[PDB]
Amino acid sequence: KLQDVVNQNAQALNTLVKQLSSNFGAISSVLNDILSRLDPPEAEVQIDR
Amino acid sequence: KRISNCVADYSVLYNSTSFSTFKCYGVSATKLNDLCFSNVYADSFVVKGDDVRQIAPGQTGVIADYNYKLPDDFTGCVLAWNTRNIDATQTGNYNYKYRSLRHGKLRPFERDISNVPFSPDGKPCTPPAFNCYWPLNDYGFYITNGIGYQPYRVVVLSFELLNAPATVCGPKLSTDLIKNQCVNFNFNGLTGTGV
Ligand SMILES: *[C@@H]1O[C@H](CO)[C@@H](O[C@@H]2O[C@H](CO)[C@@H](O)[C@H](O)[C@H]2NC(C)=O)[C@H](O)[C@H]1NC(C)=O
């Protein structure tokens, strides 16, 4: 019973972190990359997503 | 044309000429100097001024339908300038031709060369019958032509961004390496902050 709460906590945190590296419709999944490749007027379009 | 292992400066090409149609879709035109792209491709052709707009992702037109379909995910710039003075002539320039019709649509970034009369049926046609019509057609190019009918020369630069280590890097100055300090870094386009 003690191990299961730890496992669910760890799985929640790991899923949270894994969700970071994922395009949500954006051209890229790294904020740095989108800024480098796009001017702010069309950068905000991806950053909002 | 594949372009590799060379320092590429956007500024010289931008100061060189006021291009008729200059737009970068997946890239910022100004930020080209900062970033590195691997294996840039250059595609060259000549189309009438009306055709220039058709060169775009997710856009349909006779040239797009049969001649040049850009990828919808295409990342790079398109540069186009007027070329009436050197190409067009009074008698008529018919060297530059286009595939008016074709049995199907070409895939993105593909070249079609077949020179056989087209059939709307798609089955073989005899040239005398109305089924056969020549796909390969040319615009009558004249000096007196309107700017839309006047020839335009278009070069499309496609950059493969971050696929692999980038052989093509813009002109920037490397600096000395600093350790144990939380600093900015740009390793061949890998911009970031850290120690
Ligand atoms: C052909 O290449 C040359 C060199 O890049 C371009 O000529 C330059 O044009 C600018 C402005 O028109 C001048 O300031 C430079 O001095 C020129 N370079 C020279 C004389 O060496 C020319 O624009 C290019 N032709 C094109 C792009 O059609």
**What b/e string do you get for B47-56 counting C-beta neighbours within 10 Å, with b at 16 or more?**
bbbbbbebbb
Token pair of B31 as six digits: 């930020």
B34/B188 Cα distance (integer angstroms): 9
B192/B190 Cα distance (integer angstroms): 6
- Residue B63 dihedral angles phi and psi, to the nearest 5°: -65, -45
Identify whether the C-beta of residue B29 lies closer than 8 Å to the C-beta of residue B10. Answer: yes
Q: Which of B14, B16, B154, B157 to mutate to test the pocket of ligand 1 (most atoms within 8 A of CB)?
A: B16
Residue B11 CB less than 6 A away from ligand 1:
no
What is the experimental method?
cryo-EM
**What b/e string do you get for A3-25 counting C-beta neighbours within 10 Å, with b at 16 or more?**
eeeeeeeeeeeeeeeeeeeeeee
Chain A residue with Cα closest to B161: A37
Q: What is the resolution of this structure in A?
A: 4.0
Nearest CA to B172 out of B16, B32, B27, B14 is that of: B32
